[PDB]
Design a protein. Structure first.
Lengths: 7, 216, 213
C-alpha cells in the first residue's frame, strides 16, 4: 500500500 | 512484527552535536519513505524531517526551525535511519521519534536534553509517617528524591514486588535540579512486620540507592 | 503552509458515551490525513489513515470521516482504554503539521483524597535540609487546593505541587505537595499541617505532625 508515495 | 528501535539520545551542551539512530526490522526498509518526529516534554508532536527511498533519489525534507542544522540520512545496507544534529538549541530538547512512511509505525523514542546544567546524582530519603492518630487500615509510605540532573529516574518498591498502590509523581525544576516523590500504600499487618524498601535508579550518574523505611 | 486547528482542547467523557473530535485544515488537503492516539508515557499509534480508513488492530468504534478541509474522528461507546491524547496530521506537502491535541479524560464518580503528612527525613537533617512532603491520593475530579500550616501560621513560600496523569485502573488522580524549607528553619517550629480542600467536601482534610513529639 505505497511505501514511498509521490503525490 | 515491524519494529523501529531508537538510540543515541542523552545530555548535550547547547551548541553541541549528537547523532541519534533508528534500527529497523520486520519490513523491507529500502522501499519505504522514513521520517523523524519530535515531542518536547508536555507539548505536542512536531514533524522534523523526512527521507524518500533509493528509487526516488533519497530526496529529503526538513522543518524550518531545524533546516541547515539537522541532516537526516539512511544506511539501507544495515536498515538504519539517522539524524545528525549540529548546533543544538534549548528548544530542541525533546523525545525524538522514528516514524515509518506516513505514520503507521512509530519507535519508542530516545530523549534529547539540551542544557548547560551538570549531571548530578540524587539524594534519596525515606518518608515515614509522623505525629500519629492513624485513620486508615492502609498506611502510605514514600521516598523523596532530591536534586538530580538529568531525567529520568526509576523508582520501584521491594525489587518490584509491590506492583500496585504505587504513585510515582512527575518531577519539577527549580535550580537546574529535579525533584520527585514516590508513594506506596501497605496494610498495617504488612508494616513494619515486613521490610518495605524503595529502589531508586539514576542511569546517568550510575547511581543505585535502596532505602528501607524505618519507624521514627 | 497548511495549519491544522484541532477542537476541543480537552474532553471529559463517561464510559459508553460517544464523542467526536474535529480537525480543520487551513487549505484543501484532500484526504491526506491521519488520526493518532497517544497515551501519556507512550508513543503515538495510528488510528485512521487517508481520513476515512480504520488502521489494523483498532476497534470498530473508531470512525474517520471527511475530505477537503473539515475532518472529524468519532468514537462510539468510548471504552475505558480510549483515554489519552488524540492528534491529527496532514501529509499534503512538507511540513506535515500536527493538530494541537485533544486531551481525553474518563468521567468517574467523585472521590475524596486520602491525605498523608511526612516529617523531614533523619537522613535529610544530617544534610542541613528540611523538606515536608504531603500526599493527596486517589481523588476525582482533577483540581484540588492545598494549603500549608506551620505552628498555626499559614505558609505560602517554597511549596511545589505535582499532579499525576489519570491512571488506567481506577481513573483517579493523585498529587504531591512539598514544602522545602531552610533545614535550620524547620527546627524553629514544631507544629506542621497539610490542608487539602476538594470538591467532595467544604471541610478541608487536615493532617499534621509535631516535630518535638
Ligand atoms: C533521480 O535522478 C536520476 C539521475 O539524475 C534520474 O535518472 C535518469 O532520469 C533522467 C530523466 O529525468 C534521464 O535523463 C534522460 O536520458 C534520456 C536517455 O538517455 C535522454 O534522452 C534525455 O535527454 C533529454 O534531456 C536533455 C537535457 O537534459 C536534452 O539534451 C535532450 O534533448 C532530451 O530532451 C534525458 O536527459 C537519465 O538517463 C536517467 N538515468 C538513469 C540512471 O536511468 C531519475 O530520473 C531521478 N528519479 C526520479 C524518480 O525522478
Amino acid at each position: 500500500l505505497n511505501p514511498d508515495p509521490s503525490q | 512484527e515491524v519494529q523501529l528501535v531508537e538510540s543515541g539520545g542523552g545530555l548535550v551542551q547547547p551548541k553541541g552535536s549528537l547523532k541519534i539512530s533508528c534500527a529497523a526490522s520486520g519490513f523491507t526498509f529500502n522501499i519505504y519513505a522514513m521520517n523523524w518526529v519530535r515531542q518536547a516534554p508536555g507539548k505536542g508532536l512536531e514533524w522534523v524531517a523526512r527521507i524518500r527511498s533509493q528509487s526516488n533519489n533519497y530526496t529529503t525534507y526538513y522543518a524550518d526551525s531545524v533546516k541547515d542544522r539537522f541532516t537526516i540520512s539512511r544506511d539501507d545496507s544495515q536498515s538504519m535511519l539517522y539524524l545528525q544534529m549540529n548546533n543544538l538549541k534549548t528548544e530542541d530538547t525533546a523525545m525524538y521519534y522514528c516514524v515509518r512512511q506516513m505514520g503507521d509505525y512509530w519507535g519508542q523514542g530516545t530523549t534529547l536534553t539540551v542544557s548547560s546544567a551538570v549531571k548530578t546524582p540524587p539524594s534519596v530519603y525515606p518518608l515515614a509517617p509522623g505525629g500519629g492518630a492513624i485513620s486508615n487500615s492502609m498506611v502510605t509510605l514514600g521516598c523523596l528524591v532530591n536534586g538530580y540532573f538529568p531525567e529520568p529516574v526509576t523508582v520501584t518498591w521491594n525489587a518490584g514486588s509491590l506492583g500496585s498502590g504505587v504513585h510515582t509523581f512527575p518531577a519539577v525544576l527549580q535550580s537546574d535540579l529535579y525533584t520527585l516523590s514516590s508513594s506506596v500504600t501497605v496494610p498495617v499487618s504488612t508494616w513494619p512486620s515486613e521490610a518495605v524498601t524503595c529502589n531508586v535508579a539514576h542511569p546517568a550518574s550510575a547511581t543505585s540507592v535502596d532505602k528501607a523505611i524505618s519507624p521514627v | 503552509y497548511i495549519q491544522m486547528t484541532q477542537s476541543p482542547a480537552s474532553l471529559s467523557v463517561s464510559v459508553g458515551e460517544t464523542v467526536t473530535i474535529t480537525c480543520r485544515a487551513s487549505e484543501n488537503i484532500y484526504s491526506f490525513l491521519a488520526w493518532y492516539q497517544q497515551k501519556q508515557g507512550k508513543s503515538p499509534q495510528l488510528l485512521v489513515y487517508a481520513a476515512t480508513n480504520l488502521a489494523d488492530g483498532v476497534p470498530s468504534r473508531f470512525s474517520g470521516s471527511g475530505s477537503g478541509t473539515q475532518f472529524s474522528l468519532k468514537i462510539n461507546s468510548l471504552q475505558s482504554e480510549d483515554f489519552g491524547t488524540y492528534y491529527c496530521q496532514h501529509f499534503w506537502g512538507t511540513p506535515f503539521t500536527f493538530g494541537s491535541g485533544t486531551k481525553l479524560e474518563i468521567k468517574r464518580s467523585d472521590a475524596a483524597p486520602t491525605v498523608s503528612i511526612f516529617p523531614p527525613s533523619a537522613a535529610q537533617l544530617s544534610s542541613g535540609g528540611g523538606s515536608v512532603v504531603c500526599f493527596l491520593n486517589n481523588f476525582y475530579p482533577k483540581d484540588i487546593n492545598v494549603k500549608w500550616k506551620i505552628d498555626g501560621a499559614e505558609r505560602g513560600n517554597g511549596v511545589l505541587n505535582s499532579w499525576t496523569s489519570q491512571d488506567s485502573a481506577d481513573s483517579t488522580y493523585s498529587m504531591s505537595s512539598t514544602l522545602t524549607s531552610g533545614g535550620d528553619e524547620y527546627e524553629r517550629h514544631n507544629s506542621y499541617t497539610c490542608e487539602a480542600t476538594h470538591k467532595t467536601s467544604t471541610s478541608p482534610i487536615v493532617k499534621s505532625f509535631n516535630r518535638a513529639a
